[PDB]
Amino acid sequence: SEATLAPSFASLQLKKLELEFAVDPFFKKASADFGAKGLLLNHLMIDSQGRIVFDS
């Protein structure tokens, strides 16, 4: 069983996961809502500070 087993579990380890990506939900909604009626400023929403929110 010596050579069939691996030692320490570090030989079967890993530390970098394939954590696909983050894509923003505002982007996903803007894709669905936008041509000339989804002008991308009709589409957007205002903010409490007083800006246009595309980045979450």
Numbering used by the authors: 241 to 274, 278 to 299
Paper quotes:
Based on their homology to ATP binding cassette (ABC) transmembrane transporters and the Rad50 DNA damage repair protein, the two globular ATPase “head” domains situated at the ends of ∼50-nm-long intra-molecular coiled coils of a heterodimer of condensin’s Smc2 and Smc4 subunits are thought to sandwich a pair of ATP molecules between composite catalytic sites, each composed of Walker A (P loop) and Walker B motifs of one head and a so-called ABC signature motif of the opposite head. Smc2hd and Smc4hd are furthermore connected by their binding to opposite ends of the Brn1Cnd2/NCAPH kleisin subunit (Onn et al., 2007).
To reveal the interaction between the Brn1 kleisin and Ycs4 HEAT-repeat subunits at near-atomic resolution, we solved the co-crystal structure of Ct Ycs4 bound to Ct Brn1225–418 to 3.3-Å resolution (Ct Ycs4-Brn1Y4). Localization of selenomethionine residues based on anomalous difference maps and secondary structure prediction nevertheless allowed the assignment of residue numbers for almost all of Ycs4. A feature apparently unique to Ycs4 is an α-helical extension of HEAT-repeat motif 10 (“proboscis”), which showed, however, no apparent primary sequence conservation among Ycs4 homologs.
